[PDB]
Structure formats: structure tokens, C-alpha cells
């Protein structure tokens, strides 16, 4: 019990690799039949990362309803997230169809299009406001409205238009640019400053559909974002913050999508992020301003 005393115990013993390997062994295993179907081979970026049949997002089309995406429904925390892979050149239309149908207002991107000299995600959004994107297959139009660039992250305002229904919606795009694959952010302050920017925007509100969170596979960096956010919500509605066990919350999350959190250091980071973030949730308003200064966003 209690995360802060548990953190110091594991760091002194140097057993982060053992604690993480135990979570992998205890992790749920459910079928991924639709994902392994031959017609869906080119819809998957990686052969080892597939959504479970029970929690997969279904597209609203009679042809093929598949997309490598999962709905993580956290009952007690009262929040849902959609974790998906970085879209492929042939799945960008499917990605935006999912955003429309699920009524999402925000998209959280934790990777870069090109990392370590390799293509990790397609350029699914327009880089220029005069060069809008039309997805002919799903009959959707996407235009860049504005962008607010900071040192380690970018916030974009996009307009998604359904051409069949003639309706328009504003989508907020939160892009973390300095988080390496299988790595961790620069500091808990830089991560939390980003997380609270997403919270204050109104994208995570239950009035809207689930927030779309992705990276390259949508399991490592994405699992870290969602684990830290869910743990902070729980210690605000329980009235006993010390009862929150990060390992039990991660195992509950892994019931909806395989491999959430990829390394031992990513789990260690989730602990640091929640411990530091608990200060604001507890009632100390001033630490949010301290995170902005230590993140060096200017």
C-alpha cells in the first residue's frame, strides 16, 4: 500500500525490472480475431500490437468496420479514452471517421512522424492552412485553423467537416514533440504541464466523446499518459488518496488493450508523475505555475 513509500523501496532495491515483469505475467489475454483476419493485414502497423475484440472501436460502415483502436472505459474514474496506432497512409480516412462518429473533441499525439530515421506515423493533418486535406473514401475535409507552438509541444486548432451531412466541428490537436520511442519525457514537470493543458481545454469532459490518444503503436507512451491521468482522477473522488495502487489501475487498463507501458522506466516515470501531480489535486494551486517555469515552454 501507499505509492510514495513503495517508490523509495523499489528504487533502493533496484527491482524496477522485476516489478514490471510481474505486471506482464499477470496481464490479461483476450482474443484479437478480427485484427488477425487476412483482409485487415494492411490496416495494422505492427504484427504484435492488436486490439481485443471486446473493446475495439467499430466504424459505422457495412464494408469493413475495422480500425486498430480500443476503448479504455475506466468505470470508477468516470473517464474513457480511445488508444490507437499512428495511422498508415491507407488508414487516415478511417482515423478521422472514428473521430467524427465517436464525437471526440481532442486528439493527443505523443510521437513524431519520423523518429530515428524511420516513418512512425503518416502526415494525417495539414501543415499549411491553404493546403487542406480531403479524404475521398470517407467523404471528410480537414483544414488547419491555427497553431500555438511551444518549445516541446504544439497545440493545433483544426476544423473537421463531414461533406455528406454538411456539418462542421472544431478539433483540438495536442502534439508532444520531445518524447522518444520506448523513452520517458524530460521531467515530471514537462509532462504535467502538458496534461493540465489538455484538461483545461475541455476535451476530456463527459459532454463530448472520448479523447483520442496515440503514438506509433498506441501502447507505450499512450499507456503512460492515460495511467497518470486516471490515477489523478481517482485521488480526487475517493477522499483517501493513499488507497490508489498504480499497479492495480494499470492491470485494469490492460483488460482493454495489450501492452500498456512498454519499459520499466516508463512505469517508474508514471509513479513520479502521479506523486508530483498529487500536490495540485490536494489543494496547492501554486504548483501548476511552478511546472510551467520548470518545463521551459518559452
Amino acid at each position: 500500500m501507499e505509492m510514495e513509500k513503495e517508490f523509495e523501496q523499489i528504487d533502493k532495491s533496484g527491482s524496477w525490472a522485476a516489478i514490471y515483469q510481474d505486471i506482464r505475467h499477470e496481464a490479461s489475454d483476450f482474443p484479437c480475431r478480427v485484427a488477425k483476419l487476412p483482409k485487415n493485414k494492411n490496416r495494422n502497423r505492427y504484427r504484435d500490437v492488436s486490439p481485443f475484440d471486446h473493446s475495439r472501436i467499430k466504424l459505422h460502415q457495412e464494408d469493413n468496420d475495422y480500425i486498430n483502436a480500443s476503448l479504455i472505459k475506466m468505470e470508477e474514474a468516470q473517464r474513457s479514452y480511445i488508444l490507437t496506432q499512428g495511422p498508415l497512409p491507407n488508414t487516415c480516412g478511417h482515423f478521422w471517421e472514428m473521430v467524427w462518429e465517436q464525437k471526440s473533441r481532442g486528439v493527443v499525439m505523443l510521437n513524431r512522424v519520423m523518429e530515428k530515421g524511420s516513418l512512425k506515423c503518416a502526415q494525417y493533418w495539414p501543415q499549411k492552412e491553404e493546403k487542406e486535406m480531403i479524404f475521398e473514401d470517407t467523404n471528410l475535409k480537414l483544414t488547419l485553423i491555427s497553431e500555438d507552438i511551444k518549445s516541446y509541444y504544439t497545440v493545433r486548432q483544426l476544423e473537421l467537416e463531414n461533406l455528406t451531412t454538411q456539418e462542421t466541428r472544431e478539433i483540438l490537436h495536442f502534439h508532444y514533440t520531445t518524447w522518444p520511442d520506448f523513452g520517458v519525457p524530460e521531467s515530471p514537470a514537462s509532462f504535467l504541464n502538458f496534461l493540465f493543458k489538455v484538461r483545461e481545454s475541455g476535451s476530456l469532459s463527459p459532454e463530448h466523446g472520448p479523447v483520442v490518444v496515440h503514438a506509433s503503436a498506441g501502447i507505450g507512451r499512450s499507456g503512460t499518459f492515460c495511467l497518470a491521468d486516471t490515477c489523478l482522477l481517482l485521488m480526487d473522488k475517493r477522499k483517501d488518496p493513499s488507497s490508489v495502487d498504480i499497479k492495480k489501475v494499470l492491470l485494469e487498463m490492460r483488460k482493454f488493450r495489450m501492452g500498456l507501458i512498454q519499459t520499466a522506466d516508463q512505469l517508474r516515470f508514471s509513479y513520479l508523475a502521479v506523486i508530483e501531480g498529487a500536490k495540485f489535486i490536494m489543494g496547492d494551486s501554486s504548483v501548476q505555475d511552478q511546472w510551467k517555469e520548470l518545463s521551459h515552454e518559452d
Binding site: 502497423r45 505492427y46 504484427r47 504484435d48 501502447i219 501492452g259 512498454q262
Partner: peptide, 5 residues
């Protein structure tokens, strides 16, 4: 196909 891990 490729593999992530």
C-alpha cells in the same frame, strides 16, 4: 509485417 518490440 514489422514488429514493435
Amino acid at each position: 509485417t514489422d514488429y514493435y518490440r
